[PDB]
Design a protein around this ligand. Structure first.
Ligand SMILES: *[C@@H]1O[C@H](CO)[C@@H](O[C@@H]2O[C@H](CO)[C@@H](O[C@@H]3O[C@H](CO)[C@@H](O)[C@H](O[C@H]4O[C@H](CO)[C@@H](O)[C@H](O)[C@@H]4O)[C@@H]3O)[C@H](O)[C@H]2NC(C)=O)[C@H](O)[C@H]1NC(C)=O
Ligand SMILES: OC[C@H]1O[C@H](O[C@@H]2C=CO[C@H](CO)[C@H]2O)C[C@@H](O)[C@@H]1O
Ligand SMILES: OC[C@H]1OC=C[C@@H](O)[C@@H]1O
Ligand SMILES: [Ca+2]
Ligand SMILES: [Ca+2]
Lengths: 854, 83
């Protein structure tokens, strides 16, 4: 990375101004004579004691243990930005009642308790409690700062390198601090190539949230990367809390310690709009945040398979050779990707007429193999009078403009390019409509989309992005909306894929840039990483930081984007990627070809093994995503989410869990012959999924490994569903029989769910065409029952096998199901491992049934 | 008499042959289905060269045999392309 191309806090005038304010007595005070209390909110005027500027505080109790704080100017020269389209609804409120009041303080009770809010007038402060337990304080260090709109180096016009920001509205930054007593561990605020547990920023830079295209980004630093989710989670043995700072402008976050952690948010423009999510459990915080910004869109099943990409497959013959290569080497793959060279000179929605002359025929061939293709579509449009997309956007005034009213022109892949104003709802409608099969000539239903460079990336722009003073829909400046530009591109593309199918097909869109709410539109990935071991390691904390803030469909380029990975690293990367939500191999233009059959047999075999593990686990992955979609719970989880009282798990980032059932510790060092695996849980047991060896928690196990090892353990008390018949793509497998892997707890119990539907439509929601089964084992009986009776589905899927770990040898196995006489099943038992295999139950997955041992 | 796996690992009644559940370590009890991970399906390709395919390609909805016999209960109707 070239750090000089990106601003440090001292180079961002608003950050320097805000950060120069040090702890002390706040000049802000609440004017309690102006206090007004209604059923939905409390409002009160605040005044700055020196400037005499008046602000309005709108304080609200909310349902589900949350509090909203909004501060804006009482009489602004012009309205301040309020972030649209991120919140899914107007949050239901809870009534505030005055339970105490004096000349300097007001105590408010939320609904009928136990939550309370103390408003101190001078200096202005808010304290949030549950009964007598103080959870959080606001403005405790007196760092609130609200720069009012006026009619000081860099406060007005400001230059960065060769770029001048005309800054017509001058200094308008907002900032506020929060104190978290009892909290020593905080997480979130992606995207940074840094540790899962966030570092204190006291003696260095704050964390930066500003969607930027950072070429050859480096590790373990707070530089802003491609996406920004302004959500911070705090965890202790006693409680979980969340802070959601709803602001779309450049934001800097300072973290400091004292036990107590203090957080300061500093934003360029807009209002102060913050949600305090009081838990108490981390799952309560996930539900709270999901109620505000929605949940992960349910991926079509194929998008959870393996994706093969590079910059670039040369032509149709290369795509078809790659397709045939997977089949000739018995390696599954669902999708083949087409990067920017597939288009006509990077005019999106077009095809190179020599390389891709017959895209419908190429898509037909992939469809005959039950595979999909993904084509890149970026949000920069070549300035070319012969290009219809440019001519239509120019003619309809849908481009971002400069202050003089001309269409902004920057430099990107097609050379001179303009930037559609995705903040304009008519621009988004036009974009969605461009994905119709009539408009996007050469597209077909098995063609999905990748949105890259949507920060937006501008090669000749400041920090490789758009001018701060460019003008968007409604007269808002680029500085006001920057961090939601990419989200809008993602949203409009997803809606395009839904609309082209008549609203029936679920979309699949990968996006580089993102914000709060991006989970509703598809997948994200960690951008242009490098083919190095420390980048392989950092994929875990980066995707875990995203999972915690609702973006469950995350991944990193398998093999690394830049440079050539050695075969051992490529193998370990396939193994890591095979257990991460978005699983794609991708590579830079200058790299050698790295399709997995080009390696020596030992490496091919380890890669095929990893692919087979992933494909067999698709029913499990699909179910976790359904739980993410319905509840807002993360798919990939830090161990502290499952073990909140185990303080040794709070900073772990070389291990993770998938749901509550699998613990993964991928090998991430060259020449490793073993790994230290921490298996948590008092009275918990863990099964090595390969050997079936049972291990008691809590312990650190030194596990020996070879090239083909993927250290994975199943938790006792869980039931994992698999498709053991691995075929060439997920479509081929989606009607096949299931094998249930029952891992018994020390009490001889287990449970697990299974979600099934057609694999690709909204019929599960519009027609309740799905199955949600609950499998439960207790007292020598395994039972299948409905976990949601509203769901019905016509399916040939049946239960072909049950594998029970931790079971003794039965004398007999009986199956009962309505409509059939009692059945006797044959079985095999290994006394060394205590693994019992039940042969061919033969029952429909849509039916209730019971299997009794003995 | 019963069926003996070509690898000698088990002896099963012929009712467990092509019953869509894998009983032999070599996959020899399921030559006509997709049940075994290491089985093979024989494309008879009457009038042309016969071919063997992976068992996982039986009823996968993809036409693997030129005679189309690998797709007999998938919904994909394969045409004879042996020439
Ligand atoms: C909104 O907030 C309220 C208030 O915090 C919240 O309700 C509370 O939920 C917690 C659980 O997170 C409850 O705590 C339990 O209390 C019972 C006794 O009544 C205990 O048995 C429980 O103990 C378990 O956990 C302990 C470790 O933490 C173990 O030591 C023990 O063995 C048990 O496994 C636990 O302490 C609490 O009682 C309620 N409080 C009230 C007032 O209802 C509510 O869930 C939140 N709602 C939403 C939608 O977020
Ligand atoms: O479309 C090609 C390529 O585009 C992105 O990566 C670019 C490569 C180099 O430099 C700029 C940084 O200024 C990047 O945006 C993302 C890749 O995944 C993609 O293959
Ligand atoms: O005889 C046992 C079974 O074996 C095979 C198929 C079924 O027709 C029978 O019930
Ligand atoms: Ca059989
Ligand atoms: Ca086939």
């Amino acid at each position: 990375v070239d750090r000089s191309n990106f601003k440090t806090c001292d180079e961002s005038s608003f950050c320097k101004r805000q950060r120069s304010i040090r702890p002390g007595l706040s000049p802000y005070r609440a004017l309690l004579d102006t206090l007004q209390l209604g059923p939905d909110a409390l409002t009160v005027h605040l005044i700055h004691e020196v400037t005499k500027v008046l602000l309005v505080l709108e304080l609200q109790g909310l349902q589900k243990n949350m509090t909203r704080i909004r501060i804006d100017e009482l009489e602004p020269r012009r309205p301040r930005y309020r972030v649209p389209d991120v919140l899914v609804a107007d949050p239901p409120t809870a009534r505030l009642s005055v339970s105490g009041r004096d000349d300097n303080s007001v105590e408010l009770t939320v609904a009928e308790g136990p939550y309370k809010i103390i408003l101190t007038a001078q200096p202005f402060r808010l304290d949030l409690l549950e009964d007598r337990s103080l959870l959080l304080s606001v403005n405790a260090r007196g760092l609130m700062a609200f720069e009012h709109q006026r009619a000081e180096p860099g406060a007005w016009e400001e230059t960065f390198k060769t770029h001048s920001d005309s800054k017509p509205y001058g200094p308008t930054s907002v900032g506020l601090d929060f104190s978290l007593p009892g909290m020593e561990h905080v997480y979130g605020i992606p995207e940074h190539a840094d540790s899962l547990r966030l570092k204190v920023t006291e003696g260095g830079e704050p964390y930066r949230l500003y969607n930027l295209d950072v070429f050859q980004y480096e590790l373990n630093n707070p530089m802003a990367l491609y996406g920004s989710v302004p959500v911070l989670l705090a965890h202790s043995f006693h409680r979980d809390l969340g802070i959601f700072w709803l602001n779309a402008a450049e934001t800097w976050v300072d973290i400091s310690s004292n036990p107590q952690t203090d957080i300061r948010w500093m934003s360029e423009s807009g209002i102060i709009d913050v949600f305090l999510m009081l838990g108490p459990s981390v799952f309560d915080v996930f539900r709270q945040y999901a109620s505000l910004t929605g949940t992960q869109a349910l991926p079509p099943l194929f998008s959870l398979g393996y994706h093969q990409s590079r910059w670039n497959y040369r032509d149709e013959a290369d795509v078809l050779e790659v397709d045939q290569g997977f089949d000739d080497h018995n390696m599954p793959c669902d999708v083949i990707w087409l990067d920017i060279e597939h288009a006509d000179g990077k005019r999106y929605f077009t095809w190179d007429p020599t390389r891709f002359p017959q895209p419908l025929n190429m898509l037909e061939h992939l469809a005959s193999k039950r595979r999909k293709l993904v084509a890149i579509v970026d949000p920069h449009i070549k300035v070319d009078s012969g290009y219809r997309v440019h001519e239509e956007l120019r003619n309809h005034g849908l481009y971002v403009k400069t202050r003089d009213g001309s269409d902004y022109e920057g430099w990107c892949w097609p050379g001179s390019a303009s930037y559609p104003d995705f903040t304009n709802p008519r621009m988004r409608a036009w974009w969605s409509n461009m994905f119709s099969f009539d408009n996007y000539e050469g597209s077909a239903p098995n063609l999905y989309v990748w949105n890259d460079m949507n920060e937006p990336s501008v090669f000749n722009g400041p920090e490789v992005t758009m001018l701060k003073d460019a003008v968007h829909y409604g007269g808002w400046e680029h500085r006001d909306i920057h961090n939601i530009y990419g989200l809008y591109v993602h949203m409009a593309t997803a809606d395009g894929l839904i609309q082209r199918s008549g609203g029936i097909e679920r979309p699949f869109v990968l996006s580089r840039a993102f914000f709060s709410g991006s989970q509703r539109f598809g997948a994200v990935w960690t951008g242009d990483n490098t083919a190095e071991w420390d980048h392989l390691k950092i994929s875990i904390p980066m995707c875990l930081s995203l999972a915690l803030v609702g973006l469950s469909f995350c991944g990193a380029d398998v093999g690394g984007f830049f440079k050539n990975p050695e075969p051992e690293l490529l193998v370990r990367w396939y193994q890591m990627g095979a257990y991460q939500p978005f699983f794609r191999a991708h590579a830079h233009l200058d790299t050698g070809r790295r399709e997995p059959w080009l390696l020596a047999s030992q490496y091919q075999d380890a890669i095929r093994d990893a692919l087979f593990q992933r494909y067999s686990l698709l029913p499990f992955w699909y179910t976790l995503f359904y739980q993410a979609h319905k509840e807002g719970f993360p798919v990939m989880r830090p161990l502290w989410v499952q073990y909140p009282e185990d303080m040794s798990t709070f900073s772990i980032e070389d291990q993770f869990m998938l749901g509550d059932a699998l613990l993964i510790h991928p090998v991430s060092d060259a020449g490793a012959h073993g790994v230290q695996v921490y298996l948590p849980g008092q009275e918990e047991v863990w099964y090595d999924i390969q050997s079936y060896q049972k291990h008691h928690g809590p312990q650190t196990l030194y596990l020996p490994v070879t090239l083909s090892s993927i250290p994975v353990f199943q938790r006792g008390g869980t039931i994992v569903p698999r498709w053991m018949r691995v075929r060439r793509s997920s479509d081929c497998m989606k009607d096949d029989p299931i094998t249930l892997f029952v891992a018994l707890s020390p009490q001889g119990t287990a449970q697990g769910e299974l979600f099934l539907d057609d694999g690709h439509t909204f019929n599960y929601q519009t027609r309740h065409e799905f199955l949600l089964r609950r499998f439960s084992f207790s007292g020598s009986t395994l039972v299948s029952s409905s976990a949601d009776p509203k769901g019905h589905l016509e399916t040939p899927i049946w239960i072909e096998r049950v594998v029970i770990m931790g079971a003794g040898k039965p004398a007999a196995v009986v199956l009962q199901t309505k409509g059939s006489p009692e059945s006797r099943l044959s079985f095999q038992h290994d006394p060394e491992t205590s693994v019992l295999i039940l042969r061919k139950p033969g029952v429909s997955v849509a039916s209730d049934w019971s299997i009794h041992l003995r | 008499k019963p069926f003996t796996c070509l690898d000698g690992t088990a002896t099963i009644p012929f009712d467990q042959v092509n019953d869509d559940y894998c009983d032999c370590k070599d996959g020899s009890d399921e030559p006509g289905t997709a049940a075994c991970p290491n089985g093979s399906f024989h494309c008879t390709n009457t009038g042309y060269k016969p071919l063997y395919i992976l068992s996982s390609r039986v009823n996968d909805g993809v036409c693997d045999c030129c005679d189309g016999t690998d797709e007999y209960n998938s919904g994909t109707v394969c045409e004879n392309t042996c020439r």
